Amino acid sequence: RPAPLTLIGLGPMGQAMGNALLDRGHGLTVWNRTASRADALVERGAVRAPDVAAAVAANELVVLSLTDYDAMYALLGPAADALAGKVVVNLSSDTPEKTRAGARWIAEHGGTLIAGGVTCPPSGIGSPESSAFYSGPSAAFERHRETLRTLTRTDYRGEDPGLAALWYQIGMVMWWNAMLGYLQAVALADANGLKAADILPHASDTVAGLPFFLRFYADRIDTGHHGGDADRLAMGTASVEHILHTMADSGVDTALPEAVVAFFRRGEAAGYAENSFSSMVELLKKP
Amino acid sequence: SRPAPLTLIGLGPMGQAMGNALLDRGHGLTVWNRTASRADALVERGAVRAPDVAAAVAANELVVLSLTDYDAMYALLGPAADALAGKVVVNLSSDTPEKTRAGARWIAEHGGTLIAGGVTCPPSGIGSPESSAFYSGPSAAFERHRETLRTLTRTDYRGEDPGLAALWYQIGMVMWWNAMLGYLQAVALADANGLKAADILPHASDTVAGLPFFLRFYADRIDTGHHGGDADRLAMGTASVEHILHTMADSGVDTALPEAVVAFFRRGEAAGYAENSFSSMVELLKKP
Amino acid sequence: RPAPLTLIGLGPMGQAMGNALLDRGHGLTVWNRTASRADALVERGAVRAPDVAAAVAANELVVLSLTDYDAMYALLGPAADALAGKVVVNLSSDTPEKTRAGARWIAEHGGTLIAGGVTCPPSGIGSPESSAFYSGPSAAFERHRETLRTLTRTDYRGEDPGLAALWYQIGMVMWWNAMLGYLQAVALADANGLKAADILPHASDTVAGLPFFLRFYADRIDTGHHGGDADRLAMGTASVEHILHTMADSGVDTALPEAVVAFFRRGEAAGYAENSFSSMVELLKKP
Amino acid sequence: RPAPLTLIGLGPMGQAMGNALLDRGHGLTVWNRTASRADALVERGAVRAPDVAAAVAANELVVLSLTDYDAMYALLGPAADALAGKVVVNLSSDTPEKTRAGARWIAEHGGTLIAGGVTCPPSGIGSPESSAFYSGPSAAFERHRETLRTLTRTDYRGEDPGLAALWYQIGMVMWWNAMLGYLQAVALADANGLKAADILPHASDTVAGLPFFLRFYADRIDTGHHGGDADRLAMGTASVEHILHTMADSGVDTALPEAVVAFFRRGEAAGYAENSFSSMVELLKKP
Ligand SMILES: NC(=O)C1=CN([C@@H]2O[C@H](COP(=O)(O)OP(=O)(O)OC[C@H]3O[C@@H](n4cnc5c(N)ncnc54)[C@H](OP(=O)(O)O)[C@@H]3O)[C@@H](O)[C@H]2O)C=CC1
Ligand SMILES: NC(=O)C1=CN([C@@H]2O[C@H](COP(=O)(O)OP(=O)(O)OC[C@H]3O[C@@H](n4cnc5c(N)ncnc54)[C@H](OP(=O)(O)O)[C@@H]3O)[C@@H](O)[C@H]2O)C=CC1
Ligand SMILES: NC(=O)C1=CN([C@@H]2O[C@H](COP(=O)(O)OP(=O)(O)OC[C@H]3O[C@@H](n4cnc5c(N)ncnc54)[C@H](OP(=O)(O)O)[C@@H]3O)[C@@H](O)[C@H]2O)C=CC1
Ligand SMILES: NC(=O)C1=CN([C@@H]2O[C@H](COP(=O)(O)OP(=O)(O)OC[C@H]3O[C@@H](n4cnc5c(N)ncnc54)[C@H](OP(=O)(O)O)[C@@H]3O)[C@@H](O)[C@H]2O)C=CC1
């Protein structure tokens, strides 16, 4: 039987979360700084709380979908003394350190923070294939897990609130870097009469073969094997210089390929030319 | 009827795999490498060791090169460059389209024909039907040597311009290197938190497997200039990349690569794109 | 923290599965009808359970890799009452309805069935490139997902156990038809002095261009667009007659090509000659 | 540079062929039994031939895009004696033996027939990645090869005109079987509330993983290795039975899946049950 809950934060993720909760039949109380972002949900049956404090008071479960944890202090700070007995499921990105700071704040005001990292876009909220990392007090998470199953599948990573944020950041460094490479490929294509649609099949093939290299290098990096049997860093330095010069010749911004070339040059200056590019995970483990 | 003979110059990871696949099929293979040790197994398997690069070029009309760059072709084939007349040089080496076009003009000045190639597979993929390579250059020479080239990978001919195969290779490699640099950063962040690459491999594999959906979602949006903040705002993304930078700094992990990503996203915000999708950053990367 | 589990079914797929589970670090207990198939696995560190019951009792997670769901009854039947509190992940092919029956049977004995459909060959078990459809009670899937992620990536389709079987059959009808076409082309080639290796490049190109046609026809079929702008069915009827007669003139068996001609002739008999071959989806569709 | 030519047959392929030849600057003379199907190409700048006989006399090169070779005899037979010194490039599908008979017929009238098998849809005409098999006298083909390169890449397969047709059918038996498998997947999907767009990703991954299996079985079939290393026919006969029954339980036509199950039952009757499904090529091969 769908338990009622409050949702604060109605950007792309929160609007989708509200629609999924209203589809399962959860009594929903919503609040958003931009009051107009709640209009469609309230027309579908969501209750518009007149203020943030009334949203927190409406239910024990308060789900937050905000840009970061500073936004949580900005919205919940005025009525922080009424956070007693409340379970705050923060589905906002932040560092493990700031996520732990938010958990301390909520606890010092009588509440319980469960940290969440949703690994799906808005279109994936409510879909069975979607998942979210969850960390923080086990008992409070277990009590509200069934409601959270409406949004995504739940993946508990442990009692430390910082864990859900670490696992989110581990995936997002891969996602953002891959997507910035796509934006760079689309720009190179544009300068050469090619649209994103023209490069889509090749771009999709490039990313669809990446799991092979993830396993290939995982086994080796863990065993400390950085041999140049499949690849040598010097060949990669040339490849990335070719990218930089190809983009500059085509009039495309070079700031991001210049940083890549700088990284490969630091690997050669460390004596890794005949080793795999994987050898540079050692430069990364260094502050 | 029978696999054609050919010369292969360049016996590093890719060339070694190419020679093996060419012999596995039944091609008469003449080989040559600067480090002669790398031809030992291929010669044992039945290949002819050319004595001095020139002899290798003279051995066959088809000369396939697997070198680090196009400068390496000039260094090896320059001494006997006048004997390149009538020869078809398939350069499977990475380089800028402009340097690839310069290589083609040099081969042409010496009476030869250059076919440019960009192999989109690792050594383990040479010989596999799954693997492909970009090809560009004079159609007749490509069409004449295609069957032999299909032993190595599938052939994707992009046109008569030799620079086309290099452009398409660079388009895919900027994506590949950036994704794999993110993987190395994820492995380092993981190591600093007691996690091996094997512990994060499930999540890393899911993250890269969901990427084809996002390439399709943003393709039409970027092509139509639709950069609305309906699915995402650059300001949210700037916070996200800042969280990566600081999660990595708090874990003692090198921050030069995440600092470049944060600087890129903060430059978009300072140019008026904060309420737009991160896709709008292609407008700052583009030429106009 | 690699959790322990039991694997029953050590045929081509099960052997690879136990192979990957041991490589990852899982405490594996195994069992097979032909005991000799567990030899290598026990040498590598697996516990050979003396009987089926002991296999089930060793761990909560019991994974089955068998030809069908009938084999689950034959093996787990005798000690079915001890299936209480056990989660049975059945990675065995069967119909959605037979998969749904097995789930009810397991719940009658106090267990929980999670249905699975592995879309990879034995060589791909353990590879991040491989995936599997999973369907069944979400909470039991969430509890055992990390262990199932050792075999392949996990694609949860929903609570209905029949969903993982439906998604598997949707792909296998394409896979089997495509590979029966390969066997036919190899036979045609053989009858004309060409080995499979001689036609392998053209066969690979033919299958590599298929995603384009799948996308081209998807929106068309979904929207009822069966116009003959790219192709007419009468042209296709001649193409498949050309295939049948090429095979007949070369002495190749013609049962499979005659069935293809028969289907296209049914398309013509229904008034679809000037329409795209796509029109024949309406002959296959449920009324 | 762009040589003049005649195009007869303006259905989907010939319309795209004509548009590509006019785009390059080729002087084009067109003719179609349905005169109206030339209207657009004539307004684009092609000359309308009053009769097939004049179309043939207009140029040495006569390209045909017709359903089959019976259409060549019907259209060109009346003025066949005026085919002397003409190069007829027939891009029409037919059996190798009927293509060889068409070449003898053109040669009896003093012309030369070049057989063609275009391996691209109409959207691929003019694309550098598109290709066409070509067979027949090398001299005549190599005289007009550059004009044919405007349509697709030219792949010469040899002097026998039947070779282009054989290589075409080798690929088309794979293409048709894969696409009929797709139509069936789409019908099973529709019966279960799933559109083609919902199954398109899995369908695309299924057909893109096929080149691995093409290589796996190519080597094995050529050396007669048909062991159950990766698969057993009996497991496969159950898989195809699961497909047949899944489709029956969902109300989908079972004619094509029945033909597949019958073929697998012939393999089990030959004692191949414990062998690879690859063993069923011996059932198809010419005695
Ligand atoms: N978008 C995506 O695809 C995904 C994002 N995420 C994560 O989920 C979170 C939310 O995502 P998304 O919906 O895109 O987020 P946005 O950053 O676009 O906005 C989320 C909400 O935060 C509110 N907000 C931000 N700053 C403040 C502040 N100082 N005071 C008050 N309210 C504030 C916004 O209010 P207002 O409506 O007034 O602007 C909005 O409702 C992020 O942390 C993101 O990393 C998770 C996975 C996917
Ligand atoms: N490695 C990979 O996975 C892939 C790489 N590629 C591309 O293929 C090409 C080949 O790279 P790869 O096979 O990895 O190997 P390398 O680039 O490491 O070496 C290739 C060959 O070049 C030779 N060489 C380099 N510089 C010179 C020189 N100045 N004079 C003479 N010979 C020279 C080497 O000789 P020696 O043996 O004596 O060192 C070696 O045989 C590159 O352009 C690369 O971008 C394509 C796709 C995948
Ligand atoms: N093989 C493949 O490439 C793939 C197959 N699959 C699916 O996975 C499942 C297993 O595959 P695969 O390993 O090839 O299967 P097999 O049918 O070849 O063998 C699987 C196991 O089932 C056991 N078994 C079969 N029938 C019975 C029975 N009546 N009673 C008891 N045990 C029985 C066999 O025991 P014993 O050793 O004693 O014979 C064997 O260990 C199938 O459902 C298949 O559709 C999934 C994707 C790929
Ligand atoms: N369409 C495709 O995607 C591909 C098809 N092909 C092959 O190319 C050929 C052309 O196919 P497509 O372009 O689709 O067109 P069709 O096969 O549907 O028709 C082609 C032309 O043949 C003519 N024609 C057919 N029968 C006769 C006859 N008895 N007498 C006179 N003219 C006749 C038609 O004239 P009318 O206008 O009067 O009907 C039409 O212009 C086929 O052999 C096909 O296998 C190869 C590659 C891809």
User: 3-state SS of C112-143?
Assistant: EEEEEEECCCHHHCCCCCCEEEEECCHHHHHH
Task: Tell me the HSE value of C58 on the side-chain side, using a 13 A CA sphere.
Answer: 23
Sort B54 into a burial class: Cβ within 10 Å, 0-12 / 13-18 / 19+: middle
Residue D115: strand pairing partners: D90, D135
Residue type, D95: T
In DSSP notation, C247-274 reads HHHTT---HHHHHHHHHHHHHHHTT-TT
- CA B217/CA B37 separation, integer angstroms: 49
**CA D13 to centroid of ligand 4, rounded, Å:** 7
**DSSP assignment, residue B104?**
H
- CA D21/CA C283 separation, integer angstroms: 38
Contact assessment for residue A173 and residue B254, using Cβ atoms and an 8 Å cutoff: no
Of A145, A153, A212, which is closest to C156 when you measure between CB atoms? A153
Ligand 4 pocket test: pick from D65, D70, D90, D175 the residue with the most ligand atoms within 8 Å of its Cβ: D65
Task: Tell me the HSE value of A121 on the side-chain side, using a 13 A CA sphere.
Answer: 15
CA proximity to D53, closest of D22, D20, D86: D86
Task: Give the β-pairing of A112-118 and A131-135.
Answer: antiparallel
- CA B277/CA B234 separation, integer angstroms: 5
- Determine the 3-state secondary structure of A142 from DSSP: helix
Tokens standing for residue C191 = 């009858």
Tokens standing for residue C19 = 């192979």
Contact assessment for residue B28 and residue B50, using Cβ atoms and an 8 Å cutoff: no
- CA B69/CA B76 separation, integer angstroms: 12
Look at phi and psi of residue C98 and say left if phi exceeds 0, alpha if psi is from -120 to 50, else beta.
alpha
Of C129, C138, C155, which is closest to A212 when you measure between CB atoms? C129
Angle between helices A12-24 and A138-151 (to 10 degrees): 90
Residue type, A192: N
Please judge whether D153 and B143 are an interchain contact, meaning their C-beta atoms are less than 8 angstroms apart. Answer: yes
Ligand 1 pocket test: pick from A19, A66, A72 the residue with the most ligand atoms within 8 Å of its Cβ: A66
User: Rounded to 5 degrees, what are φ and ψ at D247?
Assistant: -70, -40
Please judge whether C208 and B150 are an interchain contact, meaning their C-beta atoms are less than 8 angstroms apart. Answer: no
**Cα of D1 to nearest chain C Cα, Å:** 30
Contact assessment for residue A60 and residue A86, using Cβ atoms and an 8 Å cutoff: yes
- In D, minimum Cα distance to B151 occurs at D215
Contact assessment for residue A133 and residue A168, using Cβ atoms and an 8 Å cutoff: yes
Contact assessment for residue D99 and residue D90, using Cβ atoms and an 8 Å cutoff: yes
The closest-lying atom of ligand 3 relative to the alpha carbon of residue C122 is: 3
Residue C134: strand pairing partners: C116, C156
- In B, minimum Cα distance to C204 occurs at B129
Tokens standing for residue B238 = 């700037």
Contact assessment for residue C144 and residue A117, using Cβ atoms and an 8 Å cutoff: no
Count the neighbouring beta carbons within 10 Å of the beta carbon of residue B46.
Answer: 10
Angle between helices D255-269 and D233-249 (to 10 degrees): 160
Residue from C95, C173, C195, C254 to probe the interface with D (highest D Cβ count within 10 Å)? C173
- CA C234/CA C275 separation, integer angstroms: 8
**Cα of B197 to nearest chain A Cα, Å:** 5
**Cα of C204 to nearest chain B Cα, Å:** 6
In DSSP notation, chain B reads -----EEEE--SHHHHHHHHHHHHHT--EEEE-SSGGGGHHHHHHT-EE-SSSHHHHHH-SEEEE--SSSHHHHHHHSTTGGGGTT-EEEE-----HHHHHHHHHHHHHTT-EEEEEEE-S-GGGTT-TT-EEEEES-HHHHHHHHHHHHHHSEEEEEES-THHHHHHHHHHHHHHHHHHHHHHHHHHHHHTTT--HHHHHHHHHHHHHTHHHHHHHHHHHHHTT---SSS--HHHHHHHHHHHHHHHHHTT---HHHHHHHHHHHHHHHTT-TTS-GGGGHHHHS--
Calculate the alpha carbon distances from D177 to B194, C211, C248, C261, D102 in Å: 51, 14, 17, 11, 28
Residue type, B250: D
Tell me which H or E stretch contains C88: strand C87-90
- Report whether residue D230 contacts ligand 3, using a CB cutoff of 6 Å: yes
The closest-lying atom of ligand 4 relative to the alpha carbon of residue C232 is: 18
Contact assessment for residue A164 and residue B203, using Cβ atoms and an 8 Å cutoff: no
Contact assessment for residue A215 and residue C127, using Cβ atoms and an 8 Å cutoff: yes
- CA D152/CA D129 separation, integer angstroms: 8
- CA D248/CA D240 separation, integer angstroms: 12
Task: Give the β-pairing of B113-119 and B132-136.
Answer: antiparallel
- CA D119/CA D130 separation, integer angstroms: 7
Please judge whether B143 and D154 are an interchain contact, meaning their C-beta atoms are less than 8 angstroms apart. Answer: yes
Alpha helices in B230-255 (DSSP H): 234-250
- Determine the 3-state secondary structure of D133 from DSSP: strand
Alpha helices in chain D (DSSP H): 12-24, 39-44, 52-58, 70-76, 96-108, 138-148, 162-191, 196-208, 210-222, 233-249, 255-269, 281-284
Resolution in A: 2.3
**DSSP assignment, residue D120?**
S
- CA A242/CA B176 separation, integer angstroms: 14
Count the neighbouring beta carbons within 10 Å of the beta carbon of residue A6.
Answer: 25
Calculate the alpha carbon distances from B271 to A181, A188, B65, B236, B283 in Å: 21, 21, 45, 16, 11
Ligand 3 pocket test: pick from D217, D235, D241, D242 the residue with the most ligand atoms within 8 Å of its Cβ: D235
Q: Which ligand is the nearest neighbour of the Cα of A120?
A: 1
In DSSP notation, C180-249 reads HHHHHHHHHHHTTT--HHHHHHHHHHHHHTHHHHHHHHHHHHHHT---SSS--HHHHHHHHHHHHHHHHH
Residues C67-90 as b/e (b if ≥16 CB within 10 A, e otherwise) read: bbbebbeebbeebbebbeebbbbb
Angle between helices C96-108 and D233-249 (to 10 degrees): 90
**DSSP assignment, residue B38?**
G
Q: Which chains touch C (3 or more CB pairs under 8 A)?
A: A, B, D
Tokens standing for residue C1 = 């923290």
- CA A193/CA B168 separation, integer angstroms: 12
For chain A, what are the domain ranges?
A: 1-158, 159-287
Ligand 2 pocket test: pick from B7, B16, B34 the residue with the most ligand atoms within 8 Å of its Cβ: B34
- CA D122/CA A129 separation, integer angstroms: 37
Tokens standing for residue D37 = 């199907």
Residue from C119, C123, C149 to probe the interface with B (highest B Cβ count within 10 Å)? C149
Contacts of A234 (CB under 8 A, 6+ apart): A268, A273, A274, B68
The closest-lying atom of ligand 4 relative to the alpha carbon of residue D121 is: 3
- Report whether residue A241 contacts ligand 2, using a CB cutoff of 6 Å: no
CA proximity to C224, closest of D177, D202, D195: D195
Residue nearest to atom 19 of ligand 3 (CA): C11
Task: Tell me the HSE value of B152 on the side-chain side, using a 13 A CA sphere.
Answer: 30
Residue type, C56: V
Chain centroid offset of residue A214 CA: 19
CA dihedral of D67, D73, D75, D77, whole degrees rounded to 10: 170
Residue type, C187: A
Give the binding-site residues of ligand 1, using a 6 Å CB cut-off: A 9-14, 32-34, 37, 65-67, 71, 74-75, 91-93, 118, 121-122; B 231-233, 236, 240
Residue from B243, B257, B262 to probe the interface with A (highest A Cβ count within 10 Å)? B243
Residue D88: strand pairing partners: D62, D113
**CA A47 to centroid of ligand 1, rounded, Å:** 20
CA proximity to D264, closest of D287, D243, D234, D221: D234
- Write down the residue that tokens 């990871």 correspond to: B13
Contact assessment for residue C157 and residue C164, using Cβ atoms and an 8 Å cutoff: yes
CA proximity to A184, closest of A265, A243, A249, A237: A243
- In B, minimum Cα distance to C205 occurs at B154
Residue type, C131: S
CA proximity to D211, closest of B227, C24, C179: C179
Tokens standing for residue A285 = 């483990």
- CA C262/CA D214 separation, integer angstroms: 27
Alpha helices in A69-113 (DSSP H): 69-76, 96-108
- Write down the residue that tokens 């696992």 correspond to: A167
CA proximity to C100, closest of C109, C90, C110: C90
- Write down the residue that tokens 């390209």 correspond to: D63
Contact assessment for residue A48 and residue A22, using Cβ atoms and an 8 Å cutoff: no
CA proximity to D24, closest of D44, D9, D47, D42: D44
**Cα of B126 to nearest chain D Cα, Å:** 12
Contacts of C206 (CB under 8 A, 6+ apart): D119, D171, D174, D175
Please judge whether B287 and A190 are an interchain contact, meaning their C-beta atoms are less than 8 angstroms apart. Answer: yes
**CA A64 to centroid of ligand 1, rounded, Å:** 9
User: Rounded to 5 degrees, what are φ and ψ at A10?
Assistant: -120, 50
How long a stretch of residues is chain C?
Answer: 287
Please judge whether C174 and D206 are an interchain contact, meaning their C-beta atoms are less than 8 angstroms apart. Answer: yes
**DSSP assignment, residue D67?**
S
- Report whether residue B12 contacts ligand 2, using a CB cutoff of 6 Å: yes
Residue D29: strand pairing partners: D6, D47
Sort C106 into a burial class: Cβ within 10 Å, 0-12 / 13-18 / 19+: buried
Contact assessment for residue B43 and residue B75, using Cβ atoms and an 8 Å cutoff: no
How long a stretch of residues is chain B?
Answer: 288
- Report whether residue D232 contacts ligand 3, using a CB cutoff of 6 Å: yes
- CA A266/CA C171 separation, integer angstroms: 47
Residue type, A232: R
- CA D101/CA D95 separation, integer angstroms: 10
Q: Which ligand is the nearest neighbour of the Cα of A124?
A: 1
**DSSP assignment, residue D127?**
-
Tokens standing for residue B30 = 């003449």
- Determine the 3-state secondary structure of C28 from DSSP: strand
- CA C237/CA C217 separation, integer angstroms: 18
Q: Which chains touch B (3 or more CB pairs under 8 A)?
A: A, C, D
Contact assessment for residue B255 and residue B249, using Cβ atoms and an 8 Å cutoff: yes
CA proximity to A210, closest of B179, B77, D152: B179
Contact assessment for residue D238 and residue D268, using Cβ atoms and an 8 Å cutoff: no
Contact assessment for residue A88 and residue A62, using Cβ atoms and an 8 Å cutoff: yes
Sort A104 into a burial class: Cβ within 10 Å, 0-12 / 13-18 / 19+: exposed
How long a stretch of residues is chain D?
Answer: 287
**CA D182 to centroid of ligand 4, rounded, Å:** 24
Which residue spans within B13-149 are E strands per DSSP? 29-32, 48-49, 62-65, 88-91, 113-119, 132-136
Chain centroid offset of residue A221 CA: 25
- Determine the 3-state secondary structure of A28 from DSSP: strand
User: Rounded to 5 degrees, what are φ and ψ at B26?
Assistant: 115, 25
